Amino acid sequence: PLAVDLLHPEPQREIRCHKLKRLVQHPNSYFMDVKCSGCFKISTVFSHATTVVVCVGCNTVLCQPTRGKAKLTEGCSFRKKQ
Amino acid sequence: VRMNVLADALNAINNAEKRGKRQVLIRPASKVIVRFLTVMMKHGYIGEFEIVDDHRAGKIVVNLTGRLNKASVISPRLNIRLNDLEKYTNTLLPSRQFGYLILTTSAGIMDHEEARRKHLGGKILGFFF
Amino acid sequence: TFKRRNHGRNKKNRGHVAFIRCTNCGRCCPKDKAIKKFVVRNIVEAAAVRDIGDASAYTQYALPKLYHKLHYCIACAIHSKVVRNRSREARRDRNPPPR
Amino acid sequence: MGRMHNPGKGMAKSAIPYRRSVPSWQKMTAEEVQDQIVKMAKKGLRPSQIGVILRDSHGVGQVRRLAGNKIFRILKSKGMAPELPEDLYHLVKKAVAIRKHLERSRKDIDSKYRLILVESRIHRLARYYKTKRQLPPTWKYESGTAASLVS
Amino acid sequence: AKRTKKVGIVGKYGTRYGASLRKMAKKLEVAQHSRYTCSFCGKEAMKRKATGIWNCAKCHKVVAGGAYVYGTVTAATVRSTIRRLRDL
Amino acid sequence: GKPKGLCTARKLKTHRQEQRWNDKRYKKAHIGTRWKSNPFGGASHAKGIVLEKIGVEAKQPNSAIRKCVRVQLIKNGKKITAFVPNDGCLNFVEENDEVLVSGFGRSGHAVGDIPGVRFKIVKVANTSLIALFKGKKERP
RNA sequence: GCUGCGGUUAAAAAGCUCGUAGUUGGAUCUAGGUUUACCUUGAAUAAAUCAGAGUGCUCAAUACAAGCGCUUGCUUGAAUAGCAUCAUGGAAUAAUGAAAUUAAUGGUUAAGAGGGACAAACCGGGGGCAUUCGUAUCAUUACGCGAGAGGUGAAAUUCGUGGACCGUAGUGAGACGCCCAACAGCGAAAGCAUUUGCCAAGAAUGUCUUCAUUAAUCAAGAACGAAAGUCAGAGGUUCGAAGGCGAUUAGAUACCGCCCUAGUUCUGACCGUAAACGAUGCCAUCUCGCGAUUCGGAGGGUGCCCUGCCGAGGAGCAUCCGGAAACGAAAGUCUUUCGGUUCCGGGGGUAGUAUGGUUGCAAAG
């Protein structure tokens, strides 16, 4: 349409827009506290982690790198950090 | 490789105006672009514009009043003296009654009318009408 | 004058395409350009299927089929009427003709 | 990635957040992150790998934001700068590997083409670093010595 | 300074025997008078003693090679075949 | 497209000079062999002596024999063919005659249906051919 | 044609890529309530000519005269403007420099620029070297058959009772990888397709990883570059220039058929040309709709489906504008011309010829 509000875009469009083509760029990634059943140590982890993040002393693999976002090991949950 | 942000911005404005859009987004902003748009605003060829900040060059969003026939850039920035200002205006502008020729002088960025009134030359930036 | 947007072939994103030998003339034609047809037919003609069935040595025998992928160059295809010249507008029609 | 010698118009890159401030839940100190970077450097990693590790395991989104200084600048300030910049070293290593493969397979014309491109990139980057005084003025990439230089 | 534009080692023959024959002889003369890296000590010290015999100046090993080259393509292929059959 | 940088004057000027040589007029006027190739040596008129007279088959579809005369210029001794305008004027031209000759009009190109003839006689025996045709004068 | 041309088909985009000189280069520092470059104004700047006041030489070109009182006179006009150097002011634009006893001690940001790193039951007829398999062609062995087989529009040359052709089972050589196979994929282009092993390389995608302008295009220069062709060595199955025959024909130095030589195959060197075509150079950006397709990602459902989902390709049909038109989502955003840059054209021939130079063994470039 001729009249489109470019200044205040629709939030659904902004979410379903490429990260670089938004009115202001914003990454689609996030940091998450992963909780693994067992040693119950919250571990900060990058969503698209490319290395194998390991427990500190718990010495277990928490995530597995992939082509996109890192795949959390089974039995581990995560919570987004603000 | 991008080498003239002003040229790209004026091309985007021209395309949006031809398509009849009410707003147009200009990619990387700059002081030169801001002053060009400000002169166009003072002369009434565009509506208000908003400079979107994104911790980089930024963007602009200009409201179009559907009153601009053409906005173009002259590259390279040739040096215009007061003596040939008349020839350049007669060559580039559609008529003597309207249309403005934007210069960049030491006093700043202005139109050829103000440049002549202040008796200033400088480097040509573009024109609109 | 350029007759066709695709220049008479089916070559996109490609530099060179290996050729085939036409079934009739033997001429070399690019595989994309050569006109292909897949012919599946009964091994026996419709006029003799009944004769072969009545002469069959088995209670119920399924008659096999011949499968042939034929490639024709443009000249031999036109001569055999596998394809025909079309009007300027009808040339752009790409849907296979009714069978 | 971009396009320098290839016709690749990729649009894949990192999108830095607008917020230039450290997150509230980030409790590493500006000096502790420096000592961690320095421990990793002593171990033998380079700035890209150090940043990857910090982002992946320790939650450091941006070292420039947390420590207030870039990783290479930190290592230079404390005197751990490498003789060759990371990208130049990697390019020279790639060229050495291509030459080693070509010495065995001499009909790999594609490898010859890639070697030409890689050496052109090496020369351009070396010119840039000499201009920025980050390499000795008489530095020059020698195909014979490159293996030892990069190993 | 480069003394000969193209004749090289074969310049000893002057203007005799024909350009094509001299060109054909140049390759083999260069090959037979070149030094080769010894596979045992690793130093470029393999030199032809007689047709087919190559001496290493450092480790003093004598090898049976080609007439004008230290090794031949056919010998290399035979060695590769034997090694492959050994592996599998 | 052409270069447009503010510091490309050398490239523009050199390219223009280089491409001027691909122009027929500029090359024709600056080649250097113009004087040697042109029978008149850059002049507009010349003088010569008659040798013989010829009739040239006019080009198709025209059918006629145009009556020209082969002349030898006095300045350089070159042989040319010159046309004798007006009707029955070849009679006033006899072998071994002094003639003034000029261009035909197209600057070294043949004119009309006469093939290969690019000059024309303006005076014979110091007389104007037009006067001879008009009867204002007679053969000396 | 700088203003200001044109290069899909009319003449004209180099086959493609790397690359020095040259040209051109992202944003960002007092907004408000030291050097340069550049612009303004002056200084120094022979006339004659050009532009330009006045004056009836009768007009005018011209010329620079002349015009009033009265005699011993007064006033006259004979103007005005037209690179480099120096100075003044201006501080936008474009370059350029600063720091790696107190004080905020001193590094802009991290480009929907570029490079590099990392990820992947990653993706791919991308490349190279070995290797496995496949029928088929030809030759040949064994056995059976019995007189035709082959080939054509029709024939003939030709092969065949020394038993051909045809069958079934082998053996050997070299070549080639059918079907799958596509408006499918990869590669700078030329090009790339049987299995497996190994070697080096790469795209896109993901990234809150790193450097920080390192970039675009590129005279000279350099790599690669189909087929044919040349040199040397191996191979020589098939096909097959040249050659020889049988046909057809008025002739047939051809089309058709038969037998074939170079070649076609591999290794190592030459040549550097193709309608090397998309007859459209490369980089950046804007302008529409639809539904399909290859790759990767995100979110859901059960390898497949769904998300008017996100990027990157390769296309197709709804298409503003453009174009001489054919037609082009670019060949559009151009008399409203002006983002950067390289090459090329200037009526048709002579002619890509002569000559000179240069590369090549030659052919030739």
Tab-separated table of N, CA and C (backbone and C1' of nucleotides) in Angstrom, chain C residues 1-2 5-7 9-18 20 31-32 36 69 71 88 92 94, chain G residues 8-9 125 179-186 190-192 278-279 314-317 326-329:
chain	number	residue	atom	x	y	z
C	1	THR	N	16.468	-11.268	-35.320
C	1	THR	CA	15.255	-11.690	-34.631
C	1	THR	C	15.518	-12.937	-33.799
C	2	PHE	N	15.145	-12.886	-32.525
C	2	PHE	CA	15.291	-14.016	-31.619
C	2	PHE	C	13.942	-14.710	-31.488
C	5	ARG	N	12.601	-17.310	-26.216
C	5	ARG	CA	13.245	-16.795	-25.014
C	5	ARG	C	14.289	-17.766	-24.482
C	6	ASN	N	14.028	-19.066	-24.574
C	6	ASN	CA	14.974	-20.085	-24.142
C	6	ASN	C	15.949	-20.485	-25.240
C	7	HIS	N	15.874	-19.851	-26.409
C	7	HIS	CA	16.826	-20.078	-27.494
C	7	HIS	C	16.766	-21.510	-28.010
C	9	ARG	N	16.449	-24.331	-26.358
C	9	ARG	CA	16.997	-25.357	-25.482
C	9	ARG	C	16.323	-25.294	-24.116
C	10	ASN	N	16.871	-26.066	-23.183
C	10	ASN	CA	16.454	-26.091	-21.791
C	10	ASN	C	17.664	-25.933	-20.884
C	11	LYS	N	18.618	-25.102	-21.298
C	11	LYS	CA	19.903	-24.970	-20.620
C	11	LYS	C	19.892	-23.702	-19.775
C	12	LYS	N	19.847	-23.873	-18.457
C	12	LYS	CA	19.973	-22.776	-17.509
C	12	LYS	C	20.930	-23.195	-16.408
C	13	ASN	N	21.732	-22.247	-15.930
C	13	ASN	CA	22.717	-22.494	-14.884
C	13	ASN	C	23.783	-23.484	-15.330
C	14	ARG	N	24.008	-23.597	-16.636
C	14	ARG	CA	24.829	-24.657	-17.194
C	14	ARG	C	25.672	-24.094	-18.325
C	15	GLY	N	26.902	-24.584	-18.430
C	15	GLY	CA	27.775	-24.173	-19.510
C	15	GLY	C	27.709	-25.104	-20.702
C	16	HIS	N	27.896	-26.398	-20.457
C	16	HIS	CA	27.929	-27.407	-21.504
C	16	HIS	C	27.043	-28.578	-21.113
C	17	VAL	N	26.308	-29.108	-22.087
C	17	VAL	CA	25.452	-30.272	-21.895
C	17	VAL	C	25.872	-31.339	-22.894
C	18	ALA	N	26.075	-32.561	-22.409
C	18	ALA	CA	26.451	-33.656	-23.292
C	18	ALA	C	25.329	-33.941	-24.283
C	20	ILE	N	23.301	-36.331	-27.440
C	20	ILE	CA	22.778	-37.656	-27.730
C	20	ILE	C	22.708	-37.811	-29.242
C	31	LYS	N	21.252	-32.834	-25.268
C	31	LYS	CA	20.170	-33.583	-24.636
C	31	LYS	C	19.010	-32.670	-24.262
C	32	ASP	N	19.307	-31.475	-23.752
C	32	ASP	CA	18.238	-30.532	-23.441
C	32	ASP	C	17.472	-30.123	-24.691
C	36	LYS	N	12.510	-35.403	-26.513
C	36	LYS	CA	12.436	-36.729	-25.920
C	36	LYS	C	10.988	-37.190	-25.868
C	69	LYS	N	12.826	-44.919	-24.536
C	69	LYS	CA	13.065	-43.487	-24.441
C	69	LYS	C	13.724	-43.037	-25.737
C	71	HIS	N	14.999	-40.187	-28.428
C	71	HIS	CA	15.494	-38.828	-28.591
C	71	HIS	C	15.562	-38.520	-30.077
C	88	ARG	N	2.717	-17.840	-33.637
C	88	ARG	CA	3.580	-17.057	-32.760
C	88	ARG	C	3.104	-17.128	-31.316
C	92	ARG	N	4.457	-20.166	-27.332
C	92	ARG	CA	4.717	-20.016	-25.906
C	92	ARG	C	3.971	-21.033	-25.056
C	94	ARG	N	3.260	-24.226	-23.286
C	94	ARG	CA	4.212	-25.236	-22.852
C	94	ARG	C	3.543	-26.513	-22.363
G	8	U	P	23.787	-3.760	-26.289
G	8	U	O5'	23.240	-5.189	-26.721
G	8	U	C5'	24.078	-6.335	-26.713
G	8	U	C4'	23.327	-7.543	-27.206
G	8	U	C3'	22.907	-7.490	-28.668
G	8	U	O3'	23.910	-8.020	-29.517
G	8	U	C1'	21.039	-8.052	-27.309
G	9	U	P	24.336	-7.266	-30.866
G	9	U	O5'	23.143	-7.572	-31.871
G	9	U	C5'	22.925	-8.881	-32.376
G	9	U	C4'	21.684	-8.930	-33.226
G	9	U	C3'	21.565	-7.829	-34.268
G	9	U	O3'	22.251	-8.145	-35.466
G	9	U	C1'	19.536	-8.003	-33.054
G	125	G	P	26.261	-34.401	-6.711
G	125	G	O5'	27.295	-34.764	-7.864
G	125	G	C5'	26.848	-34.978	-9.193
G	125	G	C4'	27.993	-34.986	-10.172
G	125	G	C3'	28.727	-33.665	-10.349
G	125	G	O3'	29.731	-33.476	-9.366
G	125	G	C1'	28.208	-34.588	-12.472
G	179	C	P	20.598	-41.470	-20.059
G	179	C	O5'	19.427	-42.396	-19.506
G	179	C	C5'	18.360	-42.807	-20.348
G	179	C	C4'	17.594	-43.959	-19.747
G	179	C	C3'	16.974	-43.713	-18.381
G	179	C	O3'	15.736	-43.030	-18.455
G	179	C	C1'	18.081	-45.811	-18.397
G	180	C	P	15.623	-41.490	-18.012
G	180	C	O5'	15.962	-41.501	-16.457
G	180	C	C5'	15.044	-42.009	-15.500
G	180	C	C4'	15.656	-42.031	-14.122
G	180	C	C3'	16.244	-40.711	-13.644
G	180	C	O3'	15.268	-39.877	-13.045
G	180	C	C1'	17.822	-42.447	-13.316
G	181	A	P	15.524	-38.301	-12.894
G	181	A	O5'	15.704	-37.799	-14.392
G	181	A	C5'	15.816	-36.413	-14.693
G	181	A	C4'	16.762	-36.177	-15.842
G	181	A	C3'	16.651	-37.187	-16.980
G	181	A	O3'	16.940	-36.550	-18.223
G	181	A	C1'	18.824	-37.269	-16.071
G	182	A	P	15.786	-35.772	-19.023
G	182	A	O5'	15.040	-34.924	-17.902
G	182	A	C5'	15.076	-33.501	-17.914
G	182	A	C4'	14.340	-32.916	-16.736
G	182	A	C3'	14.476	-31.405	-16.568
G	182	A	O3'	13.269	-30.870	-16.028
G	182	A	C1'	15.327	-32.487	-14.651
G	183	C	P	12.205	-30.142	-16.985
G	183	C	O5'	12.778	-28.665	-17.139
G	183	C	C5'	12.801	-27.772	-16.035
G	183	C	C4'	13.729	-26.612	-16.287
G	183	C	C3'	13.673	-25.478	-15.274
G	183	C	O3'	14.489	-25.731	-14.144
G	183	C	C1'	13.720	-24.619	-17.507
G	184	A	P	13.845	-26.129	-12.727
G	184	A	O5'	15.095	-26.613	-11.866
G	184	A	C5'	16.050	-27.507	-12.417
G	184	A	C4'	16.798	-28.266	-11.349
G	184	A	C3'	18.187	-27.743	-11.003
G	184	A	O3'	18.174	-26.666	-10.085
G	184	A	C1'	18.311	-30.060	-11.391
G	185	G	P	19.375	-25.598	-10.082
G	185	G	O5'	20.629	-26.422	-9.551
G	185	G	C5'	20.721	-26.809	-8.188
G	185	G	C4'	21.950	-27.642	-7.928
G	185	G	C3'	23.285	-26.933	-8.091
G	185	G	O3'	23.645	-26.165	-6.957
G	185	G	C1'	23.359	-29.002	-9.220
G	186	C	P	24.510	-24.823	-7.131
G	186	C	O5'	25.977	-25.351	-7.452
G	186	C	C5'	26.721	-26.062	-6.475
G	186	C	C4'	27.998	-26.621	-7.048
G	186	C	C3'	28.962	-25.608	-7.641
G	186	C	O3'	29.734	-24.935	-6.664
G	186	C	C1'	28.720	-27.415	-9.132
G	190	A	P	31.415	-21.859	-19.808
G	190	A	O5'	32.641	-22.566	-20.536
G	190	A	C5'	33.220	-22.001	-21.702
G	190	A	C4'	34.501	-22.702	-22.078
G	190	A	C3'	34.414	-24.212	-22.210
G	190	A	O3'	33.876	-24.633	-23.449
G	190	A	C1'	36.302	-23.652	-20.916
G	191	G	P	32.988	-25.968	-23.514
G	191	G	O5'	33.940	-27.077	-22.886
G	191	G	C5'	33.408	-28.219	-22.235
G	191	G	C4'	34.017	-28.407	-20.869
G	191	G	C3'	33.415	-29.520	-20.027
G	191	G	O3'	33.956	-30.790	-20.340
G	191	G	C1'	33.563	-27.553	-18.732
G	192	C	P	33.014	-32.088	-20.350
G	192	C	O5'	32.728	-32.359	-18.810
G	192	C	C5'	33.788	-32.662	-17.919
G	192	C	C4'	33.286	-32.898	-16.519
G	192	C	C3'	32.017	-33.723	-16.391
G	192	C	O3'	32.196	-35.121	-16.583
G	192	C	C1'	31.821	-31.813	-15.042
G	278	G	P	25.274	-18.720	-23.198
G	278	G	O5'	24.134	-17.660	-22.862
G	278	G	C5'	22.822	-17.808	-23.394
G	278	G	C4'	22.140	-16.477	-23.598
G	278	G	C3'	22.840	-15.525	-24.566
G	278	G	O3'	21.862	-14.750	-25.254
G	278	G	C1'	22.646	-14.489	-22.472
G	279	A	P	21.624	-14.951	-26.827
G	279	A	O5'	22.965	-14.406	-27.482
G	279	A	C5'	23.410	-13.080	-27.228
G	279	A	C4'	24.862	-12.912	-27.590
G	279	A	C3'	25.396	-11.494	-27.467
G	279	A	O3'	26.783	-11.530	-27.139
G	279	A	C1'	25.457	-12.168	-29.736
G	314	G	P	21.704	-16.947	-10.033
G	314	G	O5'	20.962	-17.992	-10.970
G	314	G	C5'	21.465	-19.310	-11.116
G	314	G	C4'	20.408	-20.243	-11.640
G	314	G	C3'	19.353	-19.612	-12.531
G	314	G	O3'	19.798	-19.427	-13.862
G	314	G	C1'	18.314	-21.023	-10.941
G	315	A	P	19.051	-18.374	-14.813
G	315	A	O5'	17.538	-18.461	-14.332
G	315	A	C5'	16.469	-18.174	-15.216
G	315	A	C4'	15.396	-19.227	-15.129
G	315	A	C3'	14.004	-18.789	-15.544
G	315	A	O3'	13.825	-18.795	-16.948
G	315	A	C1'	13.880	-19.961	-13.497
G	316	G	P	12.994	-17.621	-17.657
G	316	G	O5'	11.479	-17.986	-17.339
G	316	G	C5'	10.959	-19.258	-17.690
G	316	G	C4'	9.613	-19.508	-17.060
G	316	G	C3'	8.558	-18.438	-17.278
G	316	G	O3'	7.949	-18.527	-18.554
G	316	G	C1'	8.545	-19.134	-15.012
G	317	C	P	7.569	-17.199	-19.375
G	317	C	O5'	6.140	-16.793	-18.807
G	317	C	C5'	5.028	-17.666	-18.940
G	317	C	C4'	3.907	-17.267	-18.016
G	317	C	C3'	3.430	-15.828	-18.139
G	317	C	O3'	2.514	-15.635	-19.203
G	317	C	C1'	3.771	-16.355	-15.861
G	326	A	P	6.924	-4.921	-30.427
G	326	A	O5'	7.901	-6.127	-30.780
G	326	A	C5'	7.718	-6.896	-31.959
G	326	A	C4'	8.857	-7.860	-32.164
G	326	A	C3'	9.183	-8.750	-30.977
G	326	A	O3'	8.343	-9.888	-30.901
G	326	A	C1'	11.174	-7.781	-31.800
G	327	C	P	7.899	-10.468	-29.472
G	327	C	O5'	9.276	-10.897	-28.800
G	327	C	C5'	9.513	-10.699	-27.416
G	327	C	C4'	10.697	-9.796	-27.190
G	327	C	C3'	11.046	-9.510	-25.739
G	327	C	O3'	11.820	-10.535	-25.144
G	327	C	C1'	10.969	-7.481	-26.929
G	328	G	P	11.622	-10.899	-23.593
G	328	G	O5'	12.370	-9.723	-22.824
G	328	G	C5'	13.779	-9.576	-22.913
G	328	G	C4'	14.272	-8.427	-22.072
G	328	G	C3'	13.766	-8.385	-20.641
G	328	G	O3'	14.472	-9.256	-19.778
G	328	G	C1'	13.542	-6.248	-21.603
G	329	A	P	13.702	-9.987	-18.576
G	329	A	O5'	13.353	-8.807	-17.569
G	329	A	C5'	12.683	-9.077	-16.344
G	329	A	C4'	13.260	-8.279	-15.203
G	329	A	C3'	13.199	-8.971	-13.843
G	329	A	O3'	14.327	-8.599	-13.052
G	329	A	C1'	11.962	-6.966	-13.757
